[PDB]
UniProtKB/Swiss-Prot annotation, chain A:
Disulfide bonds: none annotated. InterPro entries: Amino_oxidase, FAD/NAD-bd_sf, Zeta_carotene_desat/Oxidored. The gene is vioA. Pfam families: Amino_oxidase. It comes from Chromobacterium violaceum (strain ATCC 12472 / DSM 30191 / JCM 1249 / CCUG 213 / NBRC 12614 / NCIMB 9131 / NCTC 9757 / MK). It catalyses: L-tryptophan + O2 = 2-iminio-3-(indol-3-yl)propanoate + H2O2; 7-chloro-L-tryptophan + O2 = 3-(7-chloroindol-3-yl)-2-iminopropanoate + H2O2. This is Flavin-dependent L-tryptophan oxidase VioA.
Length: 417, 415
């Protein structure tokens, strides 16, 4: 009827890579593959848009590194997606604290054996006081570094893996790339190749409950026009992040692993101008990291600028945008002036602008060394979970590519046995 | 967030017209007004696309009559919206059964005084065979007429108010019009007036709960990107349909009125082609009502064709799409061939195609001592909808209900 052998819920890069693997193995010749996604287009947190029509921007995932993301780089190669160089790898304008930051971290490196499981701010508060730790951490631009569930070990890692601040650790030799046409180009390639292998896509449907009926599973979905729908399937991968797994009858996270999980919100806003005015200030391809709310300001060539924030500072912008769009634009203009040491009259007004708020932008495992495998399995019901958070690269596309490969392994095992 | 004096939840023609009647008023001078809608664009069940860059199509409301719907044509003239003759007012290619229509319907009409509360299929199967009543009703193309909820008296009014079949009950006097640019032109016109007069819009936000708090109310809303949000207002209109009303925590329909409410699903599917092939059949600006699942088939000049079903048939099609767009387009093209009396291989395949399904397309009145807008027994929230009027299911109903709810809300402002 309305049934399938294998069903993947989730059409981000995790899901579509689980689809890509299964299709090639001849363990799946003549088997039926259905992919469901709650949105109307695949990608998940990869989301490329044409702004004004003149340029290509990344509302979600933006950059990758061949050092840290070789499986992603191989993917971009395999689908003939052309990469470009990502300029935002040094701060031209290192302030006094950003100066001190570099040395100030090679030196507490030892004490991470002793107290490295403290919070990152608890940790640094011992070098100088609370008030110097904050100035140091603020100066790095990523507010998540102030959370309590961010260990001081997790923190030395995060800054080593971000292009704008990597120079502060011994990860300063990592190259970074973005997509020419945008990562959605990769997503389309995988989609198209999975489609021609005969997987069937039902985009715009959202899973609500799962129950076992004997040899298989029985899914309750609700389309986005209200249409309820049910689907009998023999094998199921839930290619969706932990935050999404919480909202079902699958007893998550208890039936799946020992871990608890968390997430942070992220906010990006982009602005386009008539004239590229930041060229006078020699600013194309530069990143300021500031103490004001924009926190990280980027000038892409002569094309546009954008900023990028997280945690409390992402909620703050999602609040401001809710209070109407003209006060949001006027706060941006104010803070662009502070970062450039000028007065707001010399900042034009924009033509166009877009913004994106991700409630659960990065999801991450809260327990280090609890022995976390790439994909999870429901101990009772035998469902496979698959997400970047279940990996060493929580919060990276690479973590999706690796959870998917494991997740497609444990599936095939369930078939051939 | 912050607050507002007046809050309207809903940006269809009801809510947008409420906003209009209020900002027109001198009693609202100075007062702040906030509008919320869960969709990103205003309109509700008015949606106009412009598909294949060559024509404006209507995925919801598509026609009005100056005779049946006077306020709507006033609103059309009021906002300087051009109209055009709606072509589909008769059947050029009737079958055998749909001339027995006018002569059996206008002959079974004296019997309506004795069996008025009876459902329509019970009725017309008393004065003809059952399989002869199933052939006669289904010849009219609206599958809502096979339902116990809809009575034999409430059925003669649907037949005379719809332009494809109104000939069947002496009402060809009525004329039918569509918008030249589609009805979103109206919706944009009102919207610009209400924005120019200082109301602040918040689209993409969806109301989940209300709670009173003295002189005013506190509303829980959720953005479509997850962003939860809290808003306090002093006066509040819920300009949403009753299906939406039941989805909240506000004792509906109990604390509001002694009426029940149902709904019917609707489905429309549009198809555009490289060459306008149906001309070779003299089918342009024509409509065929057919037995097969397409039910009502429309040919817009030489630009596109579409088909329009309701009730179960609407659910037939929604299910078909759900099992893949390929099963659906080949289904359409099979039934298209059976309707024209030709082979499948002569129906070309379409370039572009769009469709919409309305889980609650029409919301109607279960009853008749009925006011045009509801008030809460206790809290004073006002509900506004086409479903509370003599015109259950027309844009006209939303205009009438809007007027009513403005006046109740102004009475609650003054005095
Ligand atoms: C602002 C931002 C910037 C980023 N920058 C980078 C970067 O530069 N480099 C990098 O490597 N990573 C980056 N990431 C992270 C990267 O985007 C993700 O890790 C990767 O896209 C996740 O792949 P995924 O398939 O596991 O998750 P997702 O993309 O979240 O896929 C989830 C999919 O499942 C669907 N879905 C969910 N739930 C349900 C349900 N209950 N029923 C049905 N369907 C459902 C969703 O619609 C979604 O399509 C960034 C993320 C954000 C938010
Ligand atoms: C297929 C179809 C064809 C039609 N053809 C015609 C025709 O030819 N002539 C005619 O007169 N009428 C026609 N109609 C009916 C016409 O569209 C409606 O009568 C009218 O548009 C409804 O107006 P409304 O403003 O009361 O509500 P709606 O148009 O339903 O708007 C309700 C609004 O409330 C919003 N909403 C709901 N719930 C919530 C919540 N919890 N939080 C926030 N926001 C919310 C919705 O987004 C929506 O914008 C047709 C309808 C359909 C479905
Ligand atoms: N890597 C993403 C964001 C990100 C990934 N992991 C984390 C962890 C964190 F604490 C903040 C942001 C992030 C980016 O910047 O493009
Ligand atoms: N007949 C209208 C809408 C409508 C109003 N009431 C009803 C009842 C019904 F059974 C079908 C449609 C309708 C149309 O052209 O779409
Ligand atoms: Mg996925
Ligand atoms: Mg409305």
């Amino acid at each position: 009827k309305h049934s399938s052998d294998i069903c993947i819920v989730g059409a981000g890069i995790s899901g579509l890579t689980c689809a890509s693997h299964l299709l090639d193995s001849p363990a799946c010749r003549g088997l039926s593959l259905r992919i469901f996604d709650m949105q109307q287009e695949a990608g998940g947190r990869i989301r490329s848009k044409m702004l004004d029509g003149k340029a290509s921007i990344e509302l979600g995932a933006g950059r990758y590194s061949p050092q840290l993301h070789p499986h992603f780089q191989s993917a971009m190669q395999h689908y003939s997606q052309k990469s470009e160089v990502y300029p935002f790898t040094q701060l031209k304008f290192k302030s006094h604290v950003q100066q001190k930051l570099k040395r100030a971290m090679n030196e507490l490196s030892p004490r991470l054996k002793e107290h490295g499981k403290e919070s990152f701010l608890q940790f640094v508060s011992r070098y100088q006081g609370h008030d110097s730790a904050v100035g140091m951490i603020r100066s790095m631009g990523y507010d998540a570094l102030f959370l309590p569930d961010i260990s001081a070990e997790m923190a030395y890692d995060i800054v080593g893996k971000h292009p704008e601040i990597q120079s502060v650790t011994d990860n300063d030799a990592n190259q970074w790339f973005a997509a020419e046409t945008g990562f959605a180009g990769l997503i389309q390639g995988i989609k198209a190749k999975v489609k021609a292998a005969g997987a069937r896509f039902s985009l715009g449907y959202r899973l609500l409950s799962v129950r076992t009926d004997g040899d298989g599973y029985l899914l309750q979905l609700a389309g986005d026009d209200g249409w309820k729908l049910e689907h009998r399937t023999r094998h199921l991968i839930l290619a969706i992040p932990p935050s999404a797994m919480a909202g079902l009858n699958v007893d998550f996270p208890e039936a799946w692993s020992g871990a608890r999980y968390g997430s942070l919100p992220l906010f990006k806003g982009f602005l386009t101008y008539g004239e590229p005015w930041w060229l006078d200030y020699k600013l194309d391809d530069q990143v300021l990291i500031v103490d004001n709310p924009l926190r990280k300001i980027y000038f892409k060539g002569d094309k546009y600028l954008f900023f990028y924030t997280d945690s409390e500072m992402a909620n703050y912008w999602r609040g401001c945008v809710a209070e109407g769009e003209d006060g949001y634009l006027e706060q941006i203009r104010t803070h662009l002036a502070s970062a450039l040491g000028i007065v707001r009259e010399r900042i034009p007004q924009p033509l166009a602008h877009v913004h994106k708020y991700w409630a659960h932008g990065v999801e991450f495992c809260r327990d280090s060394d609890i022995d976390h495998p790439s994909a999870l399995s429901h101990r009772d019901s035998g469902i496979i979970a698959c997400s970047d958070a279940y990996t060493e690269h929580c919060g990276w596309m690479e973590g999706g590519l690796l959870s998917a490969r494991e997740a497609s392994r444990l599936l095939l095992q369930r078939i051939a046995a």
